[PDB]
């Protein structure tokens, strides 16, 4: 029983936007497209998610839940909903994240990712998480697959539909054992997320079947130290994996730590060639969602 | 082919009651009055509807249909028929709803209506609707104009003569396009009804001519978010407007949701001054219809 969520839900007209090409398919198909607000001579690159041509009282009810959340947030590192279209099949309109999920991006670009990028991503992701924590919101599926890339310099947390006010391999123990989820178990997944980024996109516990994890983590085992990782960075990952959730670090601390490290990247991440890394129709009225306010 | 409708139709003697003053005029004139059952030393405030001094095989046949329905219902949030008088012109006798239609009442009283009232009205109306749904009855003209106010604390659904076992602006799409009406399209009008109450009595799509609606609603457009409405309440309105009728919510759910909200009104409706709102011949033998049983 807290404050009134006065966020506005913008309903869009089927015509206000147009699909351009499929982006990926799950049980919803996402398209890349443009949106032209009522009468504004502005064009906005967006992503249009459309429940499969189906319409099951359950599928239709989930996408809406997701819409409720996305609309109730506003932070530079969290995907915000732009609006929805109530057509035969419901469509969610979000900002276009050109480079896709961070997971694929580190894989597709290992050879060009430097410590600065990596560390800034950790900072950015932690900021978004801290934001959700302020809004007393518990993302319950934080992973490299759910971080989208607007630009190599700017990522944003997404996919927090399943979020509250399965990926057992990213789950804290309390969650796995007693379906308990707090901002702190979010930290645990943050740890694994970070771990994916440092291993340039590896699979956590690849091999070990979901069934074993609970026991494993109970023994005292964890994900290994990624090669590029100084003991400083690894230490932090480990702390996020303490069995005792209150003994794990707080996102605002995680921000503070990774920022410190972000000021002298080569001291905390050792990457061969770090120093030489480098990362990337009338479009006159194009404006990125981030500049299309209220 | 279901159960036998054993409701009793009470025929009243012209003399058993007396008109007091006109209440409003349509093609039937309604008077405010009193009814004194045969020999009972009880006086009942009532409303007497009398077909215009005319008597056309069609007009006379409609009022009777209405009587059939009203007599076949019994719920605290549905106007029940008290009896009818077979005089030169037929007269329907219903319980007096002192404060009139809810539509006028929110208009005439904006400045004194708080979230608690609003939300309880949504609950009450939904209860009456769920009742009709149980009696497999489809009100086919649910709107703020057809909800009467017994007291600011107690409203009742009415005007379901046109009901089955035009207001295009309150109509679901299936109704507008293929004259299809289910309890679910009732939900759609429920949505608009609610929407009128939150906009303190506004006209849905004011401006847009009846001709456009069908197409509009098809594009994906809807009624806007009323100012006092948190995204939670608005969300529900929207769900009632899904093109797919089975993906809209069920009155018993609508009851459940609005009740939850009714327990902490200020969290779902933001109204300036909500906290300081306030709403309202020998009459020794007066008894409200609701206490005059069987
Ligand atoms: N805003 C976006 N911009 C660009 N690509 C996106 C965007 N949102 C999703 N995608 C990608 O489109 C494909 C489908 O995404 P999506 O519909 O979210 O399925 P999902 O993430 O596997 N499960 P879910 O999010 O619950 O539907 C994946 O490659 C997503 O990473
Ligand atoms: N039971 C009642 N108590 C007080 N006012 C009523 C009652 N019933 C109707 N009225 C009002 O009397 C006026 C005429 O109502 P009514 O005869 O129902 O016309 P209508 O609702 O416009 N169309 P209809 O109901 O089909 O005849 C309107 O202001 C009604 O809201």
XYZ file of C-alpha atoms and ligand atoms in Angstrom:
650
model
C 0.000 0.000 0.000
C 2.115 2.874 -1.290
C 1.768 5.768 -3.744
C -0.595 6.080 -6.764
C 0.899 4.930 -10.001
C -0.084 7.871 -12.204
C 1.850 6.736 -15.235
C 0.002 7.327 -18.523
C -0.759 4.482 -20.859
C -0.543 5.775 -24.413
C -2.888 4.037 -26.832
C -1.658 4.195 -30.426
C -3.552 4.144 -33.709
C -2.761 1.181 -35.992
C -1.964 3.716 -38.661
C 0.433 5.898 -36.654
C 3.209 3.383 -37.306
C 4.394 0.911 -39.885
C 6.318 -2.370 -39.629
C 9.479 -2.679 -41.727
C 10.875 -6.162 -41.145
C 10.830 -8.992 -38.655
C 13.418 -8.862 -35.852
C 12.777 -12.196 -34.179
C 10.124 -14.589 -32.902
C 8.717 -17.438 -27.746
C 5.118 -16.515 -28.480
C 5.142 -13.048 -29.852
C 6.770 -11.767 -32.977
C 8.843 -8.556 -32.866
C 9.252 -6.225 -35.860
C 11.536 -3.286 -36.547
C 9.551 -0.199 -37.536
C 8.700 3.474 -37.473
C 6.107 5.453 -35.568
C 4.815 8.885 -36.513
C 2.967 10.443 -33.541
C -0.419 11.903 -34.500
C 0.504 15.158 -36.173
C 4.133 15.820 -35.361
C 6.463 15.522 -38.314
C 8.717 13.273 -36.230
C 9.532 9.624 -37.007
C 10.512 7.220 -34.233
C 12.455 3.977 -34.696
C 10.555 1.414 -32.693
C 10.010 -2.210 -31.965
C 6.513 -3.637 -32.405
C 5.679 -6.809 -30.467
C 2.548 -8.626 -31.605
C 1.125 -11.677 -29.802
C 1.116 -14.538 -32.264
C -1.919 -14.484 -34.559
C -3.496 -16.371 -31.666
C -5.297 -14.756 -28.744
C -5.556 -16.992 -25.701
C -6.980 -15.504 -22.467
C -3.547 -16.275 -20.982
C -1.218 -15.036 -23.726
C -3.293 -11.873 -24.140
C -3.232 -11.353 -20.373
C 0.568 -11.588 -20.104
C 1.521 -8.989 -22.711
C -0.783 -6.507 -20.946
C 0.920 -7.155 -17.617
C 4.207 -6.396 -19.316
C 2.694 -3.192 -20.689
C 1.573 -2.167 -17.216
C 5.148 -2.426 -15.915
C 7.059 -0.905 -18.835
C 4.724 2.061 -18.686
C 5.375 2.517 -14.986
C 9.080 3.118 -15.387
C 11.357 5.898 -16.467
C 15.087 5.503 -16.286
C 17.870 5.750 -18.873
C 18.719 2.108 -18.365
C 15.313 0.501 -18.450
C 13.281 -0.003 -21.618
C 10.228 2.188 -21.467
C 6.970 1.325 -23.218
C 5.935 3.867 -25.836
C 2.347 2.795 -26.249
C 0.134 -0.078 -27.280
C -2.281 -0.694 -30.103
C -5.606 -2.374 -29.426
C -6.123 -4.080 -32.781
C -7.349 -7.632 -33.447
C -4.070 -8.674 -31.904
C -2.489 -6.404 -29.308
C 0.789 -4.666 -30.168
C 3.373 -3.276 -27.717
C 5.450 -0.374 -28.990
C 8.880 0.079 -27.481
C 12.014 1.999 -28.447
C 14.174 0.308 -31.092
C 17.372 -1.181 -29.684
C 19.260 -1.513 -33.020
C 22.044 -3.753 -31.746
C 19.806 -6.339 -30.042
C 20.360 -8.304 -26.846
C 23.700 -7.799 -25.151
C 24.261 -11.541 -25.049
C 24.479 -11.972 -28.815
C 26.414 -8.731 -29.113
C 29.330 -9.768 -26.913
C 29.486 -13.074 -28.780
C 29.274 -11.498 -32.200
C 31.922 -8.965 -31.157
C 34.387 -10.466 -28.614
C 37.456 -9.413 -30.599
C 36.466 -5.772 -30.364
C 35.154 -5.364 -26.851
C 37.401 -3.588 -24.361
C 37.416 -3.361 -20.574
C 35.890 0.150 -20.741
C 32.810 -1.115 -22.526
C 32.453 -4.142 -20.300
C 32.796 -2.125 -17.085
C 30.474 0.627 -18.253
C 27.869 -2.030 -19.035
C 28.144 -3.317 -15.504
C 27.624 0.224 -14.227
C 24.690 0.911 -16.522
C 22.953 -2.371 -15.780
C 23.392 -1.826 -12.039
C 21.874 1.675 -12.386
C 18.781 0.291 -14.051
C 18.543 -2.379 -11.370
C 18.873 0.192 -8.590
C 16.117 2.133 -10.315
C 13.835 -0.861 -10.269
C 14.760 -1.367 -6.612
C 13.648 2.189 -5.841
C 10.353 1.544 -7.600
C 10.162 -1.473 -5.336
C 10.113 -3.590 -8.494
C 11.735 -7.027 -8.670
C 12.972 -7.960 -12.192
C 12.891 -11.698 -11.855
C 14.792 -12.696 -14.953
C 17.905 -10.533 -15.179
C 20.342 -11.984 -17.682
C 22.510 -10.976 -20.598
C 19.625 -12.012 -22.917
C 17.429 -9.374 -21.294
C 19.695 -6.364 -21.673
C 19.242 -4.533 -24.949
C 21.775 -2.418 -26.781
C 20.698 1.025 -27.979
C 24.344 1.788 -28.859
C 27.543 0.050 -27.737
C 27.756 2.895 -25.239
C 24.227 2.543 -23.902
C 22.404 -0.590 -22.764
C 18.988 -0.892 -21.067
C 17.327 -3.542 -18.928
C 14.293 -5.221 -20.485
C 12.054 -8.278 -20.356
C 10.833 -7.608 -16.827
C 7.279 -8.712 -17.644
C 7.691 -11.783 -15.438
C 8.694 -9.079 -12.918
C 6.909 -8.497 -9.572
C 6.427 -5.561 -7.149
C 12.640 -21.029 -15.898
C 16.314 -19.872 -15.810
C 17.455 -21.874 -12.821
C 21.065 -21.207 -13.819
C 20.700 -17.451 -13.132
C 18.684 -17.935 -9.951
C 19.690 -17.285 -6.370
C 19.291 -20.275 -4.066
C 16.307 -18.948 -2.085
C 14.494 -18.631 -5.385
C 15.398 -22.116 -6.531
C 14.533 -23.724 -3.192
C 11.597 -21.705 -1.853
C 10.494 -19.559 -4.805
C 11.613 -16.508 -2.775
C 12.581 -13.377 -4.778
C 13.894 -10.098 -3.398
C 15.961 -7.288 -4.879
C 18.838 -9.308 -3.409
C 18.209 -12.411 -5.482
C 18.210 -9.911 -8.327
C 21.784 -9.219 -7.316
C 22.583 -12.898 -7.764
C 21.424 -12.806 -11.359
C 23.299 -9.564 -11.773
C 26.388 -11.602 -10.814
C 25.714 -14.190 -13.496
C 24.912 -11.448 -16.009
C 28.268 -9.834 -15.303
C 29.841 -13.282 -15.533
C 28.394 -13.738 -19.027
C 29.832 -10.432 -20.165
C 33.330 -11.249 -18.919
C 33.297 -14.695 -20.530
C 32.233 -12.894 -23.713
C 28.937 -14.714 -23.802
C 29.360 -18.143 -22.253
C 26.703 -20.467 -20.851
C 26.682 -20.638 -17.022
C 27.367 -24.181 -15.822
C 27.313 -25.456 -19.411
C 26.888 -29.182 -19.068
C 25.513 -29.330 -15.535
C 21.766 -30.190 -15.866
C 19.239 -27.910 -14.163
C 18.590 -30.697 -11.632
C 22.066 -30.460 -10.085
C 22.368 -26.700 -9.489
C 20.436 -26.575 -6.208
C 22.781 -29.156 -4.645
C 25.924 -27.796 -6.310
C 25.397 -24.220 -5.108
C 24.676 -25.794 -1.729
C 28.045 -27.547 -1.608
C 29.754 -24.195 -2.066
C 30.661 -24.287 -5.754
C 30.277 -21.379 -8.215
C 30.966 -20.187 -11.735
C 34.745 -19.954 -12.401
C 36.848 -16.821 -12.717
C 36.653 -15.489 -16.245
C 40.185 -15.249 -17.765
C 40.092 -11.492 -18.372
C 39.065 -10.965 -14.737
C 41.313 -9.616 -12.000
C 40.563 -11.000 -8.583
C 38.928 -7.607 -7.812
C 36.161 -8.016 -10.365
C 35.747 -11.717 -9.638
C 35.536 -10.983 -5.939
C 32.420 -8.889 -6.617
C 30.791 -11.578 -8.707
C 31.373 -14.043 -5.857
C 29.881 -11.710 -3.209
C 26.678 -11.641 -5.318
C 26.548 -15.363 -4.828
C 26.555 -15.519 -0.988
C 23.981 -18.053 0.294
C 22.932 -15.355 2.790
C 21.091 -12.778 0.649
C 21.694 -9.840 3.060
C 25.419 -10.459 2.820
C 25.392 -9.819 -0.911
C 26.068 -6.318 -2.221
C 23.470 -3.649 -2.956
C 23.071 -2.336 -6.521
C 24.017 1.216 -5.407
C 27.269 -0.279 -4.089
C 27.703 -2.319 -7.250
C 27.387 1.007 -9.110
C 29.991 2.639 -6.899
C 32.436 -0.272 -7.271
C 32.185 -0.791 -11.024
C 32.413 2.996 -11.541
C 35.657 3.162 -9.549
C 37.008 0.377 -11.735
C 35.591 2.103 -14.813
C 38.079 4.934 -14.195
C 41.074 2.684 -14.756
C 39.693 -0.294 -16.763
C 43.006 -1.841 -17.645
C 43.745 -2.352 -13.961
C 40.730 -4.615 -13.396
C 40.226 -6.369 -16.734
C 43.138 -7.810 -18.663
C 42.256 -8.124 -22.357
C 44.737 -8.733 -25.222
C 44.740 -5.551 -27.291
C 42.351 -3.695 -24.998
C 44.102 -0.491 -26.112
C 43.184 -0.963 -29.803
C 39.508 -1.893 -29.461
C 36.729 -0.023 -31.273
C 32.936 -0.349 -31.536
C 30.150 1.237 -33.692
C 14.470 6.366 -46.870
C 14.103 9.941 -45.636
C 15.462 10.113 -42.126
C 15.336 13.890 -41.756
C 12.683 13.814 -39.071
C 14.111 10.922 -37.154
C 14.242 11.272 -33.410
C 15.277 8.547 -31.019
C 12.603 7.599 -28.467
C 14.861 9.062 -25.766
C 14.266 12.557 -27.186
C 10.526 12.214 -27.642
C 9.380 13.411 -24.213
C 5.903 13.241 -22.553
C -34.595 -24.168 -22.730
C -33.838 -23.753 -19.035
C -35.770 -23.378 -15.773
C -39.349 -22.067 -15.242
C -39.542 -18.396 -14.524
C -41.897 -18.483 -11.538
C -41.615 -14.811 -10.726
C -44.927 -13.230 -9.676
C -46.356 -10.299 -11.545
C -48.139 -8.063 -9.061
C -51.114 -6.214 -10.509
C -51.895 -3.003 -8.628
C -55.155 -1.129 -8.148
C -55.217 2.412 -9.588
C -56.232 3.569 -6.151
C -53.480 1.846 -4.153
C -51.091 4.649 -5.096
C -51.034 8.333 -5.865
C -48.808 10.473 -8.102
C -47.124 13.478 -6.482
C -45.157 15.259 -9.199
C -43.550 14.674 -12.558
C -39.951 13.403 -12.548
C -39.193 13.477 -16.256
C -40.482 12.631 -19.722
C -38.693 9.445 -24.553
C -42.261 8.192 -24.767
C -43.411 7.580 -21.273
C -43.772 10.027 -18.456
C -42.394 9.162 -14.995
C -43.875 10.526 -11.753
C -42.679 10.501 -8.161
C -45.298 9.007 -5.848
C -46.503 6.837 -3.009
C -48.032 3.384 -2.918
C -50.086 1.951 -0.077
C -50.384 -1.847 -0.473
C -53.957 -3.105 -0.068
C -54.463 -3.033 3.672
C -51.051 -2.604 5.234
C -50.507 0.748 6.879
C -47.223 1.076 4.983
C -46.412 3.782 2.413
C -43.848 3.158 -0.320
C -41.973 5.851 -2.255
C -42.230 4.806 -5.865
C -41.826 5.800 -9.444
C -44.832 5.505 -11.754
C -44.128 5.217 -15.487
C -47.119 5.800 -17.748
C -47.004 5.333 -21.536
C -47.853 8.659 -23.108
C -51.603 9.271 -23.301
C -51.232 7.323 -26.539
C -51.523 3.553 -26.851
C -49.902 2.163 -29.977
C -49.698 -1.645 -30.378
C -45.915 -1.119 -30.365
C -45.480 1.318 -27.472
C -47.898 -0.699 -25.334
C -46.023 -3.882 -26.236
C -42.614 -2.525 -25.188
C -43.472 -1.388 -21.663
C -44.895 -4.866 -20.986
C -41.678 -6.507 -22.151
C -39.833 -4.289 -19.713
C -42.259 -5.359 -16.991
C -41.611 -9.011 -17.770
C -37.871 -8.536 -17.198
C -37.920 -6.260 -14.147
C -40.249 -8.721 -12.476
C -37.896 -11.596 -13.200
C -35.021 -10.157 -11.221
C -34.007 -9.799 -7.626
C -30.680 -8.320 -6.709
C -29.640 -5.349 -4.567
C -28.156 -3.641 -7.587
C -30.881 -4.092 -10.149
C -34.138 -2.140 -10.150
C -36.970 -4.497 -9.402
C -40.510 -3.949 -10.663
C -43.063 -3.536 -7.888
C -46.183 -4.060 -9.934
C -48.190 -2.694 -12.818
C -51.585 -1.104 -13.177
C -53.848 -2.085 -16.050
C -55.740 1.181 -16.482
C -56.627 2.971 -19.732
C -52.910 3.525 -20.028
C -50.570 0.985 -18.458
C -48.448 2.064 -15.485
C -45.203 0.451 -14.264
C -44.474 0.825 -10.564
C -40.853 0.733 -9.506
C -38.931 1.750 -6.390
C -38.184 5.477 -6.116
C -34.541 6.325 -6.777
C -34.562 9.825 -5.179
C -31.236 10.986 -6.584
C -31.929 10.059 -10.224
C -29.576 8.727 -12.884
C -25.944 8.429 -11.881
C -24.895 10.394 -14.942
C -26.544 13.640 -13.865
C -25.492 13.029 -10.279
C -21.754 12.927 -10.937
C -22.102 16.067 -13.049
C -24.221 17.896 -10.523
C -21.790 16.853 -7.782
C -18.199 16.536 -9.126
C -16.725 18.752 -6.408
C -17.958 16.408 -3.708
C -17.366 12.953 -5.102
C -14.443 10.993 -3.682
C -12.557 7.919 -4.860
C -14.430 5.749 -2.317
C -17.780 6.588 -3.849
C -16.545 6.187 -7.393
C -14.915 2.811 -6.705
C -17.865 1.493 -4.733
C -20.112 2.408 -7.661
C -17.923 0.376 -9.957
C -18.216 -2.556 -7.557
C -21.969 -2.216 -7.171
C -22.621 -1.857 -10.884
C -20.441 -4.888 -11.620
C -22.396 -6.909 -9.018
C -25.681 -6.110 -10.700
C -24.165 -6.997 -14.060
C -22.842 -10.307 -12.742
C -26.330 -10.959 -11.419
C -27.838 -10.404 -14.824
C -25.140 -12.669 -16.263
C -26.193 -15.438 -13.876
C -29.800 -15.005 -14.961
C -28.405 -15.378 -18.451
C -29.741 -11.885 -19.142
C -27.969 -9.445 -21.461
C -28.556 -5.755 -20.544
C -27.936 -4.222 -23.914
C -27.734 -0.578 -22.971
C -25.492 -0.268 -19.922
C -24.471 3.336 -19.396
C -24.228 5.958 -16.697
C -27.712 7.179 -17.768
C -29.135 3.776 -16.867
C -27.810 3.469 -13.332
C -30.099 4.968 -10.724
C -29.154 6.339 -7.337
C -31.153 5.182 -4.318
C -28.591 6.893 -2.047
C -25.056 8.088 -2.817
C -24.013 4.820 -1.201
C -26.302 2.594 -3.243
C -26.850 2.537 -7.002
C -28.869 0.047 -9.091
C -28.842 -0.969 -12.742
C -31.980 -0.088 -14.697
C -33.401 0.449 -18.172
C -32.761 -3.113 -19.312
C -36.050 -3.292 -21.226
C -34.163 -3.362 -24.527
C -32.416 -6.276 -22.760
C -32.336 -9.866 -24.111
C -31.936 -13.386 -22.636
C -28.889 3.414 -30.567
C -25.871 4.185 -28.299
C -23.116 3.257 -30.706
C -20.631 5.095 -28.488
C -21.119 2.580 -25.633
C -21.171 -0.449 -27.923
C -18.602 -3.188 -28.310
C -17.369 -3.685 -31.866
C -19.102 -7.028 -32.503
C -22.352 -5.290 -31.671
C -21.674 -2.342 -33.935
C -20.509 -4.504 -36.842
C -22.621 -7.665 -36.632
C -25.344 -6.822 -34.101
C -23.792 -9.476 -31.815
C -24.408 -9.068 -28.046
C -23.050 -11.250 -25.260
C -22.421 -10.673 -21.567
C -18.947 -9.737 -22.821
C -20.095 -6.835 -24.962
C -21.872 -5.827 -21.773
C -18.411 -5.590 -20.276
C -17.444 -3.135 -22.999
C -20.255 -0.805 -22.021
C -19.313 -1.348 -18.414
C -15.912 0.079 -19.422
C -17.477 3.188 -20.913
C -19.805 3.511 -17.922
C -16.812 3.452 -15.599
C -15.107 5.921 -17.925
C -18.035 8.328 -17.559
C -17.840 8.154 -13.788
C -14.116 8.915 -13.704
C -14.476 11.851 -16.097
C -17.234 13.058 -13.764
C -19.838 12.756 -16.469
C -18.223 13.381 -19.836
C -19.461 12.402 -23.290
C -17.530 9.476 -24.839
C -15.850 10.530 -28.084
C -17.524 13.946 -27.895
C -17.197 15.337 -31.379
C -16.572 12.114 -33.281
C -19.816 11.361 -35.230
C -21.432 7.944 -34.783
C -20.326 7.074 -38.334
C -16.614 7.075 -37.461
C -16.580 4.885 -34.332
C -16.594 1.513 -36.105
C -13.450 2.447 -38.065
C -11.795 4.290 -35.172
C -12.136 1.397 -32.717
C -10.833 -0.757 -35.559
C -7.655 1.294 -35.917
C -6.893 0.667 -32.257
C -7.961 3.950 -30.672
C -9.930 4.310 -27.408
C -11.278 6.751 -24.855
C -8.422 8.604 -23.072
C -7.222 8.125 -19.513
C -9.347 10.164 -17.150
C -7.132 12.589 -15.137
C -8.038 11.193 -11.713
C -7.159 7.692 -12.948
C -4.052 5.747 -11.985
C -2.781 3.459 -14.686
C -4.259 0.570 -12.626
C -7.847 1.712 -13.031
C -7.321 2.793 -16.629
C -5.743 -0.545 -17.419
C -9.032 -2.230 -16.474
C -11.100 0.100 -18.606
C -8.827 -0.706 -21.560
C -9.092 -4.494 -21.044
C -12.895 -4.099 -21.354
C -12.242 -2.713 -24.784
C -10.283 -5.645 -26.313
C -11.483 -6.395 -29.875
C -11.497 -10.073 -28.833
C -14.502 -10.359 -26.487
C -13.184 -13.455 -24.621
C -10.040 -11.538 -23.746
C -12.029 -8.937 -21.845
C -12.596 -9.364 -18.113
C -15.553 -11.087 -16.469
C -17.869 -9.087 -14.183
C -16.994 -11.335 -11.194
C -13.350 -10.393 -11.806
C -14.286 -6.752 -12.259
C -15.953 -7.041 -8.830
C -12.846 -8.576 -7.305
C -10.544 -5.925 -8.809
C -12.573 -2.826 -7.979
C -13.165 -4.185 -4.449
C -9.417 -4.587 -3.880
C -8.978 -0.995 -5.004
C -11.975 0.032 -2.899
C -9.935 -0.885 0.197
C -7.349 1.802 -0.474
C -9.124 4.303 -2.798
C -6.526 7.018 -2.633
C -3.972 4.663 -4.153
C -5.946 4.173 -7.378
C -7.811 7.454 -7.851
C -6.097 10.785 -7.357
C -8.664 13.497 -6.595
C -7.903 16.990 -5.196
C -9.384 17.057 -1.702
C -10.526 13.438 -1.786
C -10.037 13.414 2.000
C -12.612 16.187 2.612
C -15.447 14.967 0.382
C -18.988 14.410 1.667
C -22.310 13.324 0.136
C -25.992 13.173 1.298
C -46.708 14.996 4.949
C -46.897 12.140 7.449
C -43.996 9.824 6.801
C -44.442 7.639 9.875
C -45.344 4.556 7.890
C -42.760 5.015 5.208
C -40.814 1.959 4.193
C -38.350 1.813 1.344
C -39.216 -0.748 -1.351
C -36.135 -2.716 -0.273
C -37.841 -3.540 3.042
C -41.214 -4.445 1.586
C -40.632 -8.158 0.962
C -42.740 -10.706 -1.023
N 13.291 -3.371 -28.502
C 13.914 -4.279 -29.249
N 14.761 -3.906 -30.222
C 15.406 -4.809 -30.933
N 15.250 -6.110 -30.730
C 14.418 -6.556 -29.780
C 13.722 -5.634 -29.012
N 12.966 -6.317 -28.159
C 13.180 -7.613 -28.378
N 14.062 -7.768 -29.363
C 14.538 -9.069 -29.895
O 13.527 -9.692 -30.706
C 13.585 -11.114 -30.485
C 12.340 -11.536 -29.700
O 12.240 -10.849 -28.450
P 11.018 -11.165 -27.448
O 9.689 -10.921 -28.052
O 11.253 -10.263 -26.134
O 11.197 -12.702 -26.992
P 11.949 -13.100 -25.623
O 12.825 -12.040 -25.074
O 12.767 -14.444 -25.957
N 10.792 -13.549 -24.576
P 9.817 -12.300 -24.217
O 10.526 -11.010 -24.065
O 9.034 -12.716 -22.873
O 8.702 -12.253 -25.377
C 14.828 -11.358 -29.627
O 15.998 -11.398 -30.448
C 14.818 -10.084 -28.785
O 16.125 -9.876 -28.245
N -37.124 4.908 -10.541
C -36.843 6.176 -10.830
N -36.661 7.080 -9.854
C -36.343 8.326 -10.144
N -36.193 8.744 -11.393
C -36.363 7.898 -12.418
C -36.698 6.579 -12.151
N -36.820 5.955 -13.318
C -36.568 6.842 -14.278
N -36.289 8.028 -13.740
C -35.970 9.263 -14.498
O -37.154 9.817 -15.098
C -36.796 10.361 -16.383
C -37.405 9.476 -17.474
O -36.957 8.122 -17.372
P -37.452 7.024 -18.443
O -38.923 6.869 -18.484
O -36.715 5.642 -18.061
O -36.856 7.486 -19.869
P -35.470 6.895 -20.444
O -34.594 6.282 -19.419
O -34.754 8.127 -21.189
N -35.869 5.851 -21.621
P -36.693 4.586 -21.023
O -36.191 4.107 -19.715
O -36.627 3.436 -22.148
O -38.234 5.046 -20.955
C -35.270 10.284 -16.464
O -34.679 11.394 -15.785
C -35.032 8.997 -15.677
O -33.674 8.972 -15.231
